[model samples]
Target: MCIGNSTPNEQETFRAKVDEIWFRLTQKTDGTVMRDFLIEKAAEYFKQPEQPKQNAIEVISAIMAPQEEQTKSKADLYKFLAMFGPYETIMLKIASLLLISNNKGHWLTFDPQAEKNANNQRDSISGWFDQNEPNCLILKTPTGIRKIWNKPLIEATGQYLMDENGEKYDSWDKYFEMKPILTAYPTFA
Candidate 1:
């Protein structure tokens, strides 16, 4: 929520906070050490192929869609989405939330990368909107509407909404109906 100039002092302060978060999560020595480890591990991982060995969607469908069953529980849906595609994984948590709220009663999970992306987008959008407009309307990005409706992308849009104006809508479904063009995914519920 604190929106200030990106000065060196600010950067250092932000870095310190990030380090604290890393330390808390890893429970390791300190920020610098954990950060270095993270950097090294990331570089090593990135050297490998970006694509998954198996088709995520095919794998998910196989697990979720039995003989004739077409739909799945929210928990199942989250698990399926996690393995559904590289991008869908980001939506797992939000989907889990939705599933739970809908009384689906499932415990879904996802990789940390998806969590990070979703969190970052939320933070960005919240900060942007908090600083700009408090009450604004949200519209879908014309191109985003074409992509799959997933957590990461929707979270990104929420962040986008915050950035453009703090337009707090009920959900992505409503936003899509209001402005279908700008949304990344077209489908509703």
Candidate 2:
């Protein structure tokens, strides 16, 4: 999908074009001027049919479409999170916190110990929510609602929650840092 609308022939042609450009850029240009050759080659290259805008529309549609697969749903989830604002500062942190809390059963708060029960044991904690009171966020842990002095959720930039690996991060400092290595690359062939 990364090379959408391009056949191997076209890809090879594109590679040749690049190689030719590099040759002209760094080596002998015969009787041709470098700038002129570059412009001419660029014009010729772009003269071939292209519809990047339309391709983008199709890609967006596929991403936003209702789920037919798990990967699609995950894609939709991230896409939904992206509606908040910037991906790096806001959504990534929220996503990391959510995975930490849900997957590892950790409270999305700084004080994990505050979640002790009446019998003095750990309690089942879910998510965090800010009450009507200013800075009063209720975690579903046993010890009860209290203000997060670090103001993790309130401030745009703060690291007050543990990540999936029990490490605190302001961003995807480790987890989701990159696309996990694929065992096999997808291809038309």
- C-alpha-based local distance difference test score of model 1: 0.31
Best by lDDT: 2
Candidate 1 structure, TM-score to reference: 0.24
Model 2 CA lDDT for position 20: 50
lDDT (Cα) of model 2: 0.34
lDDT by residue (54-90, candidate 1, tens digit) is 4333333333434254322332322332221223233
Q: Write the per-residue lDDT of candidate 2 for residues 17-106, one digit (tens) a residue.
A: 434544544353333333333333333432214534444333333323332322222222222222212222433344454564545555
Candidate 2 segments exceeding 4 Å error: 1-88, 106-123, 131-136, 149-189
Poorest lDDT segment (10 consecutive residues) of candidate 2: 76-85
Once model 2 is optimally superposed onto the true structure by TM-score, how far is the C-alpha of residue 23 displaced, in angstroms?
51
